């Protein structure tokens, strides 16, 4: 659909375009509008019909390309250890992101569960005394158990063993020669631990 | 005199208290200071979702307002966290009792493309059929059309712009601009020359650089503040002018000096208009009366409703793409009011009525200066980007409990 | 060096007991053979990718075995594949090119060496390729005529399972390690026991008595194998599964014997932790590295040889002249290692363990050393 002298828009690999329309294409619709453009009858009250039905809404733009999002998971999560026993995450709500250009303090990324009855959306400048110390929070900040992700082999070993099972931490030491002068002394001693012992 | 100092002190105190109260009223706040003030702001339809990443990337079209420097049409990138990543049990602050911690997670706002532009960018709008094509209103009579794909990422070493298309027909600067969502290449512009210009750039040759006006409408007797195509009809378009008049024009009508319909919309200058996406008959116009009038196309003599909670002139009015009952309006009063149509004529408690009319839903007073232009995100609901006169761009979203409840 | 652990089971997650590269290869891509409990002998193609990581290509599957296959060995020419298992019969395979849907290439049995009573655990080829030696659970090590396909000699002096056999490259001896903590060296011509090595003295007793203990490990070892090996030049014999009593405790080690005398080792390479079970030497003679002129070298010759000793959960990479090993790898498999095998060029060291997965240790160009221009000629006795 090249318009004039301009090339058509090129959708990239992970690109999504918001829908150009929010309602199904009704064919006669436009023509009917023409009639309602000419009649100018005050019969219809839109606000009256608004309260008698549910508002028309649309969701966030999702991907719909053919064969777009197909993935594979080769890991099963095994959780071991009590840790600290933090409260349930679900009862804390969405994590709010609050960042400011003039704040030396880094961006805030976390939940907010404080409750007030006076900080209203109808009045953003509504003070809430004794609910939050009305001072700058930036100047003070100006100065500054186990969740294993087992693979198939590790999952089989965990099933065979149990909770006592732990993943393997491979230990490899590179080619360390006696002629090497810049070689690490730690690896040198670890390999000297296997030094040959001669018998006379 | 002392008026400027008093205003500055009051605005600074209001910004401080608003910043303190922002956790209760917002789920997303991103304050960014641009190099130059932007008179325009429009979300691009592109959203990139890199697989394996907990964020999406949106794009914004902005302008520059330089008193004595080279102006640029700007395309900028904004990173927004994914919905699935908004629930994360990373750290638990034992003191505040929240799953918070400032950490290192932050929204990345950076400029992607800068293009030269002779004079300030009054308003920049992209063609829906092709987001690569962007139309800009200059302080001159001509209207510029760019294809940012055919331009370098960094601007020219010197010299003014090299527009892909130059549109003639006007005789003074303007601010109202709209593409036709049903006819590709049909562009409408409104200027102080009391006329509305219509161009059809769908048949421009490859080497064609200047396009003359296809049609000129002269119904308005004052400065035509804004013009906007109808979202579903390829022949109807609305316009609001300084003559307190809103005109609905039909392109099939041969009389280009008399609109198909005329309405005395307001008692003073009407600066903007917008069509509801979910209703072919309903539109809204923001005036200098500090009011937003709701108009039904089936009955133009009677005003459906008048939103009255702004403290000064209103310059931009835009609907919510994801909700027909949600409207927004900004102006010189440094406030962005979000209204709910479903709350019109509802019984309100005496103390709640102190704050405003029942249809008023949210107030965005995070701007320290006049809000130049705001825009709704078409991909992320309730996300609004607003640019003000003090080179401040804010991409924000009010709290979920405010609208969902 | 690089370690690439194969995360895909070669033998249906059954334990893999043996590995061997095709010794006849002379290029860059090598052929490997694996034996497992699934009664299969699988031949694969191994080559380094553009990035330097080893890549395995499946070539053929040999399912003629009816029980677990424990030992797989390629002939020195790489033409004959010897496979032994719990069925007590050794199969000799050759490429079936006219002189099986899963196979890219085909192999067929040429000889079925019968004469063993129990599971076959180790096999070693002779240099000429016309003689073979095999060890089995039946307490006998059998020497076979490859050309005739018939049994030629039986050694029944063992008192338990025979878990390792090596053939002298100079054609003078055959070395067997059995579960009775006894090392036996048979004269290749007399067909009798030439040397018997079981005990070793350490230091001097507190009262001046001769404090002598047993060199080798008891049956407590988890590995079926005790695969000792001769040096490619034949100068040294490396026998794993040994014990050294440094003090009041014991330590696992690998003993190194010389041709000068076979009843006492020159030295022992200690492996604290698990016991050593396999020994395999790189077939490439390397030039001597510039090093201090100490008597550290196991043998003083104008060349050196790199070898590897595999314990239950680790692999140690030694050379000739140095004392400490130049390489160490561990914690790559969840169970006991079963076998190791070098490639023809020395670029690959394949390790197979009893958890069903194998791994490779890869060396880049001239990383192990500088190969000799001419491989030294051997002074065979015969």
Curated annotation (Swiss-Prot), chain A:
Give the comment on domains: Contains one Pro-Xaa-Val-Xaa-Leu (PxVxL) motif, which is required for interaction with chromoshadow domains. This motif requires additional residues -7, -6, +4 and +5 of the central Val which contact the chromoshadow domain.
Q: Which top-level group of life is the source organism from?
A: Eukaryota
Where it sits in the cell: the answer is: Nucleus
- Similarity comment: family membership: Belongs to the CHAF1A family.
Function according to Swiss-Prot or TrEMBL: Acts as a component of the histone chaperone complex chromatin assembly factor 1 (CAF-1), which assembles histone octamers onto DNA during replication and repair. CAF-1 performs the first step of the nucleosome assembly process, bringing newly synthesized histones H3 and H4 to replicating DNA; histones H2A/H2B can bind to this chromatin precursor subsequent to DNA replication to complete the histone octamer. It may play a role in heterochromatin maintenance in proliferating cells by bringing newly synthesized cbx proteins to heterochromatic DNA replication foci.
Q: Spell out the protein name for this chain.
A: Chromatin assembly factor 1 subunit A
Give the Acidic residues compositional bias ranges.
Answer: 137-144
Organism name: Homo sapiens
Subunit structure, as described in the record: Homodimer. Part of the CAF-1 complex that contains RBBP4, CHAF1B and CHAF1A. CHAF1A binds directly to CHAF1B. Only minor amounts of RBBP4 are complexed with CHAF1A and CHAF1B in G1 phase. Interacts with PCNA; the interaction is direct. Interacts (via the PxVxL motif) with CBX5; the interaction is direct. Interacts with MBD1. Interacts with histones H3.1, H3.2 and H3.1t.
Curated annotation (Swiss-Prot), chain B:
- Kindly state which keywords UniProt assigns to this record, in alphabetical order: Acetylation, Cell cycle, Chaperone, Chromatin regulator, Chromosome, DNA damage, DNA repair, DNA replication, Isopeptide bond, Nucleus, Phosphoprotein, Repeat, Repressor, Telomere, Transcription, Transcription regulation, Ubl conjugation, WD repeat
The reported result of mutating residue 173 to A is:
Loss of interaction with ZNF827 and loss of localization to telomeres
Q: Per the record, what is the consequence of mutating residue 389 to A?
A: Decreased interaction with ZNF827
Q: Name one GO cellular component term.
A: nucleoplasm
Q: Where in the cell is it found?
A: Nucleus; Chromosome, Telomere
The record's section on SMART domains has: WD40 (SM00320)
- Residues bearing Phosphoserine are 104, 349
Pfam families, per this entry?
CAF1C_H4-bd, WD40
Q: Where are the WD repeats?
A: 26-119, 120-169, 170-217, 219-264, 265-308, 309-365, 366-398
Q: Where is this region: Interaction with ARMC12?
A: 1-126
- Cite the record's tissue specificity text: Expressed in neuroblastoma cells.
State the disulfide connectivity.
none
An individual GO BP term: DNA repair
Q: What is the effect of changing residue 175 to A?
A: Loss of interaction with ZNF827 and loss of localization to telomeres
**What the protein does?**
Core histone-binding subunit that may target chromatin assembly factors, chromatin remodeling factors and histone deacetylases to their histone substrates in a manner that is regulated by nucleosomal DNA. Component of the chromatin assembly factor 1 (CAF-1) complex, which is required for chromatin assembly following DNA replication and DNA repair. Component of the core histone deacetylase (HDAC) complex, which promotes histone deacetylation and consequent transcriptional repression.
The protein's name:
Histone-binding protein RBBP4
Q: Which organism is it from?
A: Homo sapiens (Human)
What is the gene called?
A: RBBP4
From Swiss-Prot, chain C:
**WD repeat ranges, renumbered to this chain:** 11-54, 64-99, 115-154, 157-196, 216-267, 287-328, 332-373
Keywords, in A-Z order: Acetylation, Cell cycle, Chaperone, Chromatin regulator, Cytoplasm, DNA damage, DNA repair, DNA replication, Nucleus, Phosphoprotein, Repeat, WD repeat
List-wise, which residues carry Phosphothreonine?
382
Gene Ontology CC, one term: nucleus
Q: Where in the cell is it found?
A: Nucleus; Cytoplasm
One example GO MF annotation: unfolded protein binding
Q: How is it modified after translation?
A: Differentially phosphorylated during cell cycle. During mitosis the p60 subunit of inactive CAF-1 is hyperphosphorylated and displaced into the cytosol. Progressivly dephosphorylated from G1 to S and G2 phase. Phosphorylated p60 is recruited to chromatin undergoing DNA repair after UV irradiation in G1, S or G2 phases.
Q: Name one GO biological process term.
A: DNA repair
Q: Summarize subunit and interaction data from the UniProt record for this chain.
A: Subunit of the CAF-1 complex that contains RBBP4, CHAF1B and CHAF1A. CHAF1A binds directly to CHAF1B. Only minor amounts of RBBP4 are complexed with CHAF1A and CHAF1B in G1 phase. In G2 and S phase also monomeric CHAF1B is detected. Interacts with histones H3.1, H3.2 and H3.1t.
Q: Give the function comment from the record.
A: Acts as a component of the histone chaperone complex chromatin assembly factor 1 (CAF-1), which assembles histone octamers onto DNA during replication and repair. CAF-1 performs the first step of the nucleosome assembly process, bringing newly synthesized histones H3 and H4 to replicating DNA; histones H2A/H2B can bind to this chromatin precursor subsequent to DNA replication to complete the histone octamer.
Family recorded in the similarity comment: Belongs to the WD repeat HIR1 family.
Q: What is this protein called?
A: Chromatin assembly factor 1 subunit B
Q: Which organism is it from?
A: Homo sapiens (Human)
Its gene?
CHAF1B
């Amino acid at each position: 659909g090249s318009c004039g002298k301009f090339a058509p828009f090129e959708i990239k690999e992970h690109m999504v375009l918001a829908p150009r329309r929010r309602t199904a294409f009704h064919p006669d619709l436009c023509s009917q509008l023409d009639q309602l453009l000419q009649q100018q009858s005050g019969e219809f009250s839109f606000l009256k019909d608004l309260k008698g039905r549910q508002p028309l809404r649309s969701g966030p733009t999702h991907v719909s390309t053919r064969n777009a999002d197909i993935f594979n998971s080769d890991v099963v999560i095994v959780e071991r250890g009590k840790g600290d026993g933090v409260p349930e995450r679900r009862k804390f709500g969405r994590m709010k992101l609050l960042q400011f250009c003039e704040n030396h303090r880094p961006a805030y990324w976390g939940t907010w569960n404080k409750k007030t009855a006076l900080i209203r959306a109808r009045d953003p400048w509504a003070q809430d005394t004794k609910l939050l110390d009305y001072e700058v929070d930036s100047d003070e900040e100006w100065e500054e158990k186990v969740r294993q992700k087992l693979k198939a082999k590790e999952w089989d070993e965990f099933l065979a063993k149990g909770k006592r099972f732990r993943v393997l931490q491979p230990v490899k030491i590179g080619c360390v020669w006696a002629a090497d002068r810049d070689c690490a002394g730690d690896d040198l001693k670890v390999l000297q631990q296997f030094a040959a012992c001669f018998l006379e | 005199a002392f008026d400027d100092a008093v205003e500055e002190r009051v605005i600074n105190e209001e910004y401080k208290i608003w910043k303190k109260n922002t956790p209760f009223l917002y789920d997303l706040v991103m304050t960014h200071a641009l190099e130059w003030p932007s008179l325009t702001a429009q979300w691009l339809p592109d959203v990139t979702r890199p697989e394996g990443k907990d964020f999406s990337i949106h794009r914004l079209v902005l302008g520059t307002h330089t008193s004595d420097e080279q102006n640029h049409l700007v395309i900028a990138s904004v990173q927004l966290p994914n919905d699935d990543a908004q629930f994360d049990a990373s750290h638990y602050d034992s003191e505040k009792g929240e799953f918070g911690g400032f950490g290192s997670v932050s929204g990345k706002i950076e400029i992607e493309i800068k293009i030269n532009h002779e004079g300030e960018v009054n308003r920049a709008r992209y063609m829906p059929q092709n987001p690569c094509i962007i139309a800009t209103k200059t302080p001159s009579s001509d209207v510029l059309v760019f294809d940012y794909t055919k331009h370098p990422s960094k601007p020219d070493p010197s010299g003014e712009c090299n527009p892909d298309l130059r549109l003639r027909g006007h005789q003074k600067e303007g601010y109202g601009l709209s593409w036709n969502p049903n006819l590709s290449g049909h562009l409408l512009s409104a200027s102080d020359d009391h006329t509305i210009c219509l161009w059809d750039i769908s048949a421009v040759p490859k080497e064609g650089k200047v396009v003359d006006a296809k049609t000129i409408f002269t119904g308005h007797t004052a400065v035509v503040e804004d013009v906007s195509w109808h979202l579903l009809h390829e022949s109807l378009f609305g316009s609001v002018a300084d003559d307190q008049k809103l005109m609905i024009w039909d392109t099939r009508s041969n009389n280009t000096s008399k609109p198909s319909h005329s309405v005395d919309a307001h008692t003073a200058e009407v600066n903007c208009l917008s069509f509801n996406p979910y209703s072919e008959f309903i539109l809204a116009t923001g005036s200098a009366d500090k009011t937003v009038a709701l108009w039904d196309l089936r009955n133009l003599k009677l005003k459906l409703h008048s939103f009255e909670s702004h403290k000064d002139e209103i310059f931009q009015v835009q609907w919510s793409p994801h909700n027909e009952t949600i409207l927004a309006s900004s102006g010189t009063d440094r406030r962005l009011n979000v209204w709910d149509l479903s709350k019109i004529g509802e019984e309100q408690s005496p103390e709640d009525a102190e704050d405003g009319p029942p249809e008023l839903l949210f107030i965005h007073g995070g701007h320290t200066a006049k809000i130049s232009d705001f825009s709704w995100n078409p991909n992320e609901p309730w996300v609004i980007c607003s640019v003000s006169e003090d080179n401040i761009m804010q991409v924000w979203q009010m709290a979920e409990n405010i609208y969902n409840d | 060096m690089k370690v690439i652990t194969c995360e895909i089971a070669w033998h249906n997650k059954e334990p893999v007991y043996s590995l061997d590269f095709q010794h006849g290869t002379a290029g860059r891509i090598h052929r490997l053979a694996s034996a497992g409990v699934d009664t299969n002998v699988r031949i694969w193609k191994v080559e380094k990718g553009p990035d330097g990581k080893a890549i395995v290509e499946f070539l053929s599957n040999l399912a003629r075995h009816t029980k677990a296959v424990n030992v797989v060995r390629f002939s020195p020419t790489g033409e004959i594949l010897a496979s032994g298992g719990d069925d007590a019969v050794i199969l000799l395979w050759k490429v079936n090119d006219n002189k099986a849907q899963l196979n890219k290439e085909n192999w067929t049995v040429v000889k079925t060496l019968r004469g063993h009573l129990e599971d076959v655990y180790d096999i070693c080829w002779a240099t000429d390729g016309n003689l073979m030696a095999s060890a089995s659970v039946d307490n006998t090590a059998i020497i076979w005529d490859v050309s005739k396909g018939q049994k030629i000699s039986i050694f029944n002096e063992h008192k338990s399972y025979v878990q390792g056999v090596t053939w002298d490259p100079l054609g003078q001896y055959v070395a067997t390690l059995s579960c009775d903590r006894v090392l036996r060296v048979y004269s290749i011509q007399k067909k009798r026991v030439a040397f018997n090595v079981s005990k070793m003295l350490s230091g001097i007793g507190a009262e001046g008595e001769a404090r002598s203990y047993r060199m080798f490990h008891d049956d407590s070892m988890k590995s079926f194998f005790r695969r000792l090996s001769f040096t490619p030049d034949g100068s040294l014999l490396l026998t794993p599964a040994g014990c050294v009593e440094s003090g009041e405790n014991v330590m696992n080690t690998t003993y190194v014997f010389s041709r000068k005398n076979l009843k006492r080792p020159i030295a022992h390479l200690p492996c604290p932790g698990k016991a050593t079970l396999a020994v395999r030497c790189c077939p490439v003679y390397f030039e001597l590295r510039p090093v201090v002129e100490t008597g550290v070298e196991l043998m003083s010759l104008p060349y050196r040889l790199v070898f590897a000793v595999a314990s239950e959960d680790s692999v140690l990479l030694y050379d000739t002249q140095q004392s400490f090993p130049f390489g160490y790898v561990s914690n790559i498999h969840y169970h006991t290692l079963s076998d190791i095998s070098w490639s023809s060029d020395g670029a690959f060291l394949a390790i197979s363990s009893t958890d069903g997965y194998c791994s490779f240790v890869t060396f880049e160009k001239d990383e192990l050393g500088i190969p000799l221009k001419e491989k030294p000629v051997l002074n065979m006795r015969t």
